[PDB]
Amino acid sequence: GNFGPYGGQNVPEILMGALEELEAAYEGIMKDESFWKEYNDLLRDYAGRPTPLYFARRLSEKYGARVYLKREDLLHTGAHKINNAIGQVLLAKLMGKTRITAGTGAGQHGVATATAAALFGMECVIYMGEEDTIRQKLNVERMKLLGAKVVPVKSGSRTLKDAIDEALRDWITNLQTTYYVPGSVVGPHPYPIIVRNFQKVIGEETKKQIPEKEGRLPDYIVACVSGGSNAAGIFYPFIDSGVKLIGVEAGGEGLETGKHAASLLKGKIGYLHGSKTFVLQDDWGQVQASHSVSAGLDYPGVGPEHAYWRETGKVLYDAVTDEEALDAFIELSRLEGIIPALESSHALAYLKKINIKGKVVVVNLSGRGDKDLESVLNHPYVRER
Amino acid sequence: KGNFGPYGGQNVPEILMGALEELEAAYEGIMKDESFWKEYNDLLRDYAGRPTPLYFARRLSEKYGARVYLKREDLLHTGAHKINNAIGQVLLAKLMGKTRITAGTGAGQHGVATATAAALFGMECVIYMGEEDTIRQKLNVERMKLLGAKVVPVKSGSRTLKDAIDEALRDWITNLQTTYYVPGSVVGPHPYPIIVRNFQKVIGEETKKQIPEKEGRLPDYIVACVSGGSNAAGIFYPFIDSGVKLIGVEAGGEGLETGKHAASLLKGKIGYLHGSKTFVLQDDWGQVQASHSVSAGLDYPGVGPEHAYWRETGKVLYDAVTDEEALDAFIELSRLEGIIPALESSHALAYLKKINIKGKVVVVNLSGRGDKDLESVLNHPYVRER
Numbered sequence: 023g024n025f026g027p028y029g030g031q032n033v034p035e036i037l038m039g040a041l042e043e044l045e046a047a048y049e050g051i052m053k054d055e056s057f058w059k060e061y062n063d064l065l066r067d068y069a070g071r072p073t074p075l076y077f078a079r080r081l082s083e084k085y086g087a088r089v090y091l092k093r094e095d096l097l098h099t100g101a102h103k104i105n106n107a108i109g110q111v112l113l114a115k116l117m118g119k120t121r122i123t124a125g126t127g128a129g130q131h132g133v134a135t136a137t138a139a140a141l142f143g144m145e146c147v148i149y150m151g152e153e154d155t156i157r158q159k160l161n162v163e164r165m166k167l168l169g170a171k172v173v174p175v176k177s178g179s180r181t182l183k184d185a186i187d188e189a190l191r192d193w194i195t196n197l198q199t200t201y202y203v204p205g206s207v208v209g210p211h212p213y214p215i216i217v218r219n220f221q222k223v224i225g226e227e228t229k230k231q232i233p234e235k236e237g238r239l240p241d242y243i244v245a246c247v248s249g250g251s252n253a254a255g256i257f258y259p260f261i262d263s264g265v266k267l268i269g270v271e272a273g274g275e276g277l278e279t280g281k282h283a284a285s286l287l288k289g290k291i292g293y294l295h296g297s298k299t300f301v302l303q304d305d306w307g308q309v310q311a312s313h314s315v316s317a318g319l320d321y322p323g324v325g326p327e328h329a330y331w332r333e334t335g336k337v338l339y340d341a342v343t344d345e346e347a348l349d350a351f352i353e354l355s356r357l358e359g360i361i362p363a364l365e366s367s368h369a370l371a372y373l374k375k376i377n378i379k380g381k382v383v384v385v386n387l388s389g390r391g392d393k394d395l396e397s398v399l400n401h402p403y404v405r406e407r
Numbered sequence: 408k409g410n411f412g413p414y415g416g417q418n419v420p421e422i423l424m425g426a427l428e429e430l431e432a433a434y435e436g437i438m439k440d441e442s443f444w445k446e447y448n449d450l451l452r453d454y455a456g457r458p459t460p461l462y463f464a465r466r467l468s469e470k471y472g473a474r475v476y477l478k479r480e481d482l483l484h485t486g487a488h489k490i491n492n493a494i495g496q497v498l499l500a501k502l503m504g505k506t507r508i509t510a511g512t513g514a515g516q517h518g519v520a521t522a523t524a525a526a527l528f529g530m531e532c533v534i535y536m537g538e539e540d541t542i543r544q545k546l547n548v549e550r551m552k553l554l555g556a557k558v559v560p561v562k563s564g565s566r567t568l569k570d571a572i573d574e575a576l577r578d579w580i581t582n583l584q585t586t587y588y589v590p591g592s593v594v595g596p597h598p599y600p601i602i603v604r605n606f607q608k609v610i611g612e613e614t615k616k617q618i619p620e621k622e623g624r625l626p627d628y629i630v631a632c633v634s635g636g637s638n639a640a641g642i643f644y645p646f647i648d649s650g651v652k653l654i655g656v657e658a659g660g661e662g663l664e665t666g667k668h669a670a671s672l673l674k675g676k677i678g679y680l681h682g683s684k685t686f687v688l689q690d691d692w693g694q695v696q697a698s699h700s701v702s703a704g705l706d707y708p709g710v711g712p713e714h715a716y717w718r719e720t721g722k723v724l725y726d727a728v729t730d731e732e733a734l735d736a737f738i739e740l741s742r743l744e745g746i747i748p749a750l751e752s753s754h755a756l757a758y759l760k761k762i763n764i765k766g767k768v769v770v771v772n773l774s775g776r777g778d779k780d781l782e783s784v785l786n787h788p789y790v791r792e793r
C-alpha cells in the first residue's frame with residue numbers, strides 16, 4: 023500500500039481487521055471471472071461504457087489545437103464516480119455486508135453510491151456537509167429518490183472533509199454490517215488501489231480511442247485533481263509513456279490567499295483519512311479548511327499515488343482559480359453545448375495555460391454540470407458578466 | 408407524400424408553403440449525401456453517445472415475472488431522445504443557410520436539445536415555453552440559459568406546450584428568411600413528421616439488433632409513452648408488421664373519463680393542429696381543448712398523424728395510464744433499479760402493471776431521465792401522502 027513514502031494504513035487499530043478482510047476479499051475478486059463478468063456487464067448496459075472520445079470542434083478552433091473530451095459526463099448519474107461505486111458496492115454485497123456508508127461533496131459520489139446500493143438492495147447512509155447540501159441540492163434530491171438517507175454534517179467547515187469524518191465514524195460504529203465506500207483515491211490501503219483500479223478503464227479506453235483519431239498518443243492529457251480519482255483513472259495507463267500528464271488543483275481565490283484546495287502545491291506531508299500524503303496544514307500540524315467554488319474539489323488532502331507521481335515527475339501539477347473555472351464552465355456551455363461539472367471546468371480552464379497550438383489534448387470531462395447551475399447563475403462573478 | 412392514410416398533410420397558412428417546399432427539397436437532397444450522414448452519425452456517436460444500451464432490469468423482471476429490458480435513451484447527451492432529432496434538424500438548418508433556430512418545448516428536453524445543437528453549430532436560438540412549464544421544469548430553463556438560448560415564457564392559453572408551439576410557429580412565420588423551426592415531435596406539416604421519425608428510428612434499429620443478443624428472438628412487447636409520438640415512432644417504426652405487440656401509452660391524467668388528460672388517440676376527434684390532420688382533443692364545436700398531464704412533455708392535445716394511421720390499421724395498440732400510476736412507476740424504478748426516469752417515460756413503465764407479462768420478453772423505451780422532475784414529484788400531494 024505504499025507509493026514511495028506515501029500511502030499506508032494510518033487508522034485506529036479497531037479498523038485493522040476490517041482492512042485485512044477487505045484486502046483478502048479484493049485479492050479474491052482479482053481472479054474471479056464471475057465478478058468481472060457481472061461488473062463489466064453493468065458498466066456496459068447500466069452505466070453506459072465505453073464513453074466516447076469527442077472532438078470538440080469549436081474549442082479546437084478557438085485554441086488552434088486538436089481538443090478531445092473524454093465524455094465521462096455521459097455515464098449514468100453524470101460522473102466517473104459510478105465506475106467505482108458499482109465496483110465497491112458489488113464487492114460489499116459479495117462480502118455479506120448489508121449496509122453502505124460514504125461521504126460526498128459534489129453529491130456525485132453520494133448519488134453513484136446510492137444508485138448502486140439501490141441496484142444491489144443495500145441500506146445506504148450518505149454524509150454530506152451542510153454547505154454542500156445547499157450548493158449541490160439537485161444531488162440531495164436524487165439520493166432521496168434512490169432511497170438513501172442523507173445526513174447533513176454541521177461541524178467544522180460543513181464541506182467534504184467533515185462529511186468524510188462522519189462517514190468514517192459511522193463505519194467504525196457499524197463494523198459488523200457496513201462497508202465504507204470512499205469516493206476518491208484517499209484512504210488506508212487497500213482503498214487507493216481499489217478506487218484507482220476501477221477508474222483506470224477511463225485511461226484504457228482513451229488509449230485505444232486516441233490512435234483512431236490521430237494515429238498516435240496525445241501530446242497532453244489534462245484532468246482536475248482534488249482527491250485524485252478521475253485523474254488517476256485517465257493517467258494510470260499513460261504513466262511513463264511520454265504524454266504530458268497535467269493534474270489541475272483548485273486554486274480557489276488564489277494560491278497566495280489561503281483560500282484554496284491545492285494540497286500538492288501548498289500542503290505539507292501529513293496524515294488524513296487513513297493516508298500519509300500532502301495535506302493543507304498550519305505550522306503545528308493542524309489540518310486546515312480548504313476552499314473552492316467547486317464542492318467536489320473542496321478537500322484539503324490528495325491521494326498518495328498523486329503525491330508519488332508529483333515527486334517522481336511522472337505527472338505535472340498546477341492550479342486554476344475559481345474565476346478561471348467559472349469562465350471555462352460558461353465557455354464549454356456556449357461553444358460546445360456541453361455544461362461541464364465545475365470540477366472538470368478546472369481542467370478545461372487549463373487549456374489557456376499551455377502552449378497547445380497544433381497539439382492533441384485530451385481533457386477528462388469527469389462529469390456534467392447540472393448540479394452547479396443554480397450556484398453558477400447566482401455567483402457574484404458571473405453576475406458581473 | 409405527407410399522408411399516412413387520411414392523416415397528416417400540409418394544413419398551414421399559405422405563407423408557409425414556399426418554406427415547406429424548400430425544406431422538402433433540401434431534405435430529399437441530403438438523403439443521398441454521404442457527407443451529411445457522415446457528419447450526423449459521427450455526432451450521434453461521440454456527441455450524443457449512440458448506441459445506447461439495452462439494459463436488463465433484473466429487479467423489475469423479478470417483480471413482474473417477465474424479462475424486462477430498458478432501452479436507455481436517458482443516457483444520451485441532454486438526457487432524452489430529443490437530441491437525435493435536434494442534432495439532425497439543426498445540421499439541416501445550417502446546410503440550408505439559416506442563421507437562427509426557433510422551437511417550443513414542454514418538458515424543456517427538446518428546448519435543451521435544440522439549444523445544445525444551436526450552440527454547437529453557432530446559431531442564434533429562441534425557445535418558447537409555457538409559463539407553467541418554466542416552473543415545473545425549471546432545471547431545463549437554467550440549462551437553456553447556460554447554452555446561450557433565449558427562453559420566452561408563454562403566458563397565454565393554458566401556459567403549457569400547445570401555447571408554446573403556437574408562439575414558436577408565430578415566430579417562424581415572422582422570421583422565415585433567417586429561421587428554421589425545429590419541431591420536437593412527429594406533429595407538424597409535411598415533411599416534418601417524416602423528418603423527425605427518420606431521425607428517431609435509430610432507436611428501434613439499434614433495439615432490433617440488440618434484442619437477439621439477449622434473447623435469440625424478437626420481444627413479445629415493446630412499450631413507449633406517446634403524446635406527440637416521436638420516441639414511440641422511433642422505437643416502433645422498424646418493428647411495424649413484425650408480429651411484436653407494440654403498445655403506445657398516452658397520458659391519462661386524472662382519468663380517461665375526467666376530461667383532464669392528454670389522450671388524443673383515445674379521446675380526441677379528427678381535426679387539424681399545428682399543420683397536421685390528426686386526432687385532437689376538441690369540443691363538439693371544433694374548438695381545441697386544453698390538455699392536462701402531471702408530465703409536462705405529454706401535456707399536449709394532439710398526436711402525430713403516423714400514430715393516428717397505425718392505430719386505425721391496428722399496427723400499434725394504444726392505451727393510457729393516470730398521473731398517479733406514472734408517479735408510482737417513477738418512484739418504483741428509482742428505488743428498485745437505481746434509475747430516475749422522466750415522468751413521460753414513467754407512463755410506459757406504469758403499463759407493465761396493466762398487461763399479463765409473466766414469462767414474456769418486454770422492451771420499454773426509457774425516453775429520458777427524471778432529474779427535471781424531482782422537485783415536482785417530491786412536492787406532489789399524492790407523493791407527500793406516501
Ligand SMILES: C=C(/N=C/c1c(COP(=O)(O)O)cnc(C)c1O)C(=O)O
Nearest residue numbers: 126127130131248250251252318388389
Ligand atoms: C467529491 C465528490 N466529487 C468529486 C468530483 C471530482 C474530483 O474528485 P477526484 O479528484 O477524486 O476525481 C471530479 N469530477 C467530478 C464530476 C466530481 O464529482 C463527490 O461527488 O462527493
Ligand SMILES: C=C(/N=C/c1c(COP(=O)(O)O)cnc(C)c1O)C(=O)O
Nearest residue numbers: 512513516517634636637638704774775
Ligand atoms: C414535449 C417535450 N418532451 C416530450 C417527451 C416525451 C413525449 O414526446 P414524444 O411523444 O414526442 O416522444 C417523452 N419522453 C421525454 C423524456 C420527453 O421529454 C419537450 O421536451 O419539449
Ligand SMILES: [O-][n+]1cccc2ccccc21
Nearest residue numbers: 186204205206208249321
Ligand atoms: O469519499 N471520499 C473519502 C475520502 C477522501 C475523499 C476525497 C475526495 C472525495 C471523496 C473522498
Ligand SMILES: [O-][n+]1cccc2ccccc21
Nearest residue numbers: 572590591592594635681
Ligand atoms: O415541438 N413540437 C412542435 C409541434 C408539436 C409538438 C408535440 C409534442 C412535442 C413537441 C412538439
Ligand SMILES: [K+]
Nearest residue numbers: 248285321323
Ligand atoms: K485537495
Ligand SMILES: [K+]
Nearest residue numbers: 634671707709
Ligand atoms: K396527446
